[PDB]
Design a protein around this ligand. Sequence first.
Ligand SMILES: C/C(=N\NC1=NCCN1)c1ccc(NC(=O)Nc2ccc(/C(C)=N/NC3=NCCN3)cc2)cc1
Ligand SMILES: C/C(=N\NC1=NCCN1)c1ccc(NC(=O)Nc2ccc(/C(C)=N/NC3=NCCN3)cc2)cc1
Lengths: 282, 282
Amino acid sequence: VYPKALRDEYIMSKTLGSGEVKLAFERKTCKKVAIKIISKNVETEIEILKKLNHPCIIKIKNFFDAEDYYIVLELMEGGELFDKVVGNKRLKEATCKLYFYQMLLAVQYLHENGIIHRDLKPENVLLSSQEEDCLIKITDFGHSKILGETSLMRTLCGTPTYLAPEVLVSVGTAGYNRAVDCWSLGVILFICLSGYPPFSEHRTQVSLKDQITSGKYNFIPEVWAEVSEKALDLVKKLLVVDPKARFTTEEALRHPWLQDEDMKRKFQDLLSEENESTAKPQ
Amino acid sequence: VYPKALRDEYIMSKTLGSGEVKLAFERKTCKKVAIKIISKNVETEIEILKKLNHPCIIKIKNFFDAEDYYIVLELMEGGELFDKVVGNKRLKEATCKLYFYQMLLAVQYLHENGIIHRDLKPENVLLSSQEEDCLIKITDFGHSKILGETSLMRTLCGTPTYLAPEVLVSVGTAGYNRAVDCWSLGVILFICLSGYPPFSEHRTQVSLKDQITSGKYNFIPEVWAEVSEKALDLVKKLLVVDPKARFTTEEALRHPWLQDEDMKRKFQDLLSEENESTAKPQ
Ligand SMILES: C/C(=N\NC1=NCCN1)c1ccc(NC(=O)Nc2ccc(/C(C)=N/NC3=NCCN3)cc2)cc1
Ligand SMILES: C/C(=N\NC1=NCCN1)c1ccc(NC(=O)Nc2ccc(/C(C)=N/NC3=NCCN3)cc2)cc1
């Protein structure tokens, strides 16, 4: 059964997806919520999500630590982005841009606040409505990590008389862990624009691993002919194998493909619609 | 002042070294102890040290979490190994071997139990008496780390469709973090045998960093002429720059230099002397 403290505040309803996500109604307000059930690092995910405040990142409404974990969240009526890209379905380039812009803003906000998501995937991008133009929110912070003062920094404060060479070599590449999120964004954007994954074991002899470490994405010219050169250019700068040369979220946001004032206006318009609100002075 | 709970059990006395280490007497037994004062990860060090049971690893007797941290430990009357190797003083090769054998046993025991020390240095090797033949104990677990289930293992359980190349590349070298302890042991052994450090900014133009990552130790043939070829051979196998080719503690313990039954008998003899005891059946 559901725990009593949850039943106290919420009436539970039908499954929305699957881990498992259920529809519920908050008794106090009679408004719909979603309740993620995680069968029994969740404490950390909760703590991370409670501190973050961004319109493209999902907010926690409540939490119950019972026989399983129950996380109450805002209901995202559009479901998962995954459902929009399966079956080689693909979005209009304009829609890809709106969604990707928001993903970039979200991930930029995470990285500024010392958080790496580490599991960015279409399944973890939720749409706020069934309309094609809508807000997206990033979810599922179960693999996420907090950037802080490292043991490396502490190690490098002394003289390395006794220090191993591999530690000194790792200084070259440290502090670029956040770049794994930009690679994922790149893969997501590729999928959204083309309707197929860049690295896959479908109709090829190269191993998935070897595809990825070489950076050799599967390019099918006629799927891409309809897509703009600027869109593909950005994809190329995100799917760079060297994490230090890979585009950051800031660099992606400055890319020509995202200098689209129509898209940006539509995003601001959707934000205003969402928000309610409170009177202001002057 | 000292905290009341400490004063309750112990009478405090003179400084033994410096962090700071004081002599004290346990009131109950009238026997000497050492009290490490760490001015305000210690919780973890305590938890690690409480679980470990080896004659060459220092034991915690008591702990007080007051305005500073106070860790009560067995008194090691010989002091630090550092004091035996400063001023280009060097130990008899036979004594180096006895001490190094014990360090190896200690570090082997740590690695079998999923602990890496990460700060092995002459300062953290304590001698049990002022006699040249004595027991040693490794101390100071403030930088130590617990090997466990990694985020890498979890990441590799799914299909890496969205996974970044650098993660896949790091699989090649993961799980060799323990090898930094073997490099330190190598540096320690070098110092003990020769009376000088292998990597240093003394009378050279090569940077310390460049000395270490190239593995080019400073070899002065006439300091070493008196040292056996087998001793130096082991040093060479520990100061290997590739962490995967570096000798492990097991490989070091199988090295010809440590197949010395006289040395091993002396170690067992010193162990028996230390222990007291309890009657046994049959
Ligand atoms: C509108 C909709 N579907 N529409 C359709 N379906 C049925 C009938 N109509 C919908 C379907 C699924 C979701 N899922 C969701 O929000 N999921 C979600 C999952 C996980 C998390 C979090 C924070 N997970 N964290 C966690 N996962 C593993 C370990 N950490 C947040 C939201 C939201 C909406
Ligand atoms: C016999 C002796 N000196 N003799 C001589 N001197 C004066 C008069 N005669 C002596 C001197 C110093 C020590 N130190 C010691 O045990 N130190 C010790 C230090 C730290 C720790 C630990 C567990 N530290 N952990 C901690 N350090 C930093 C963060 N974590 C344990 C033992 C022991 C014995």
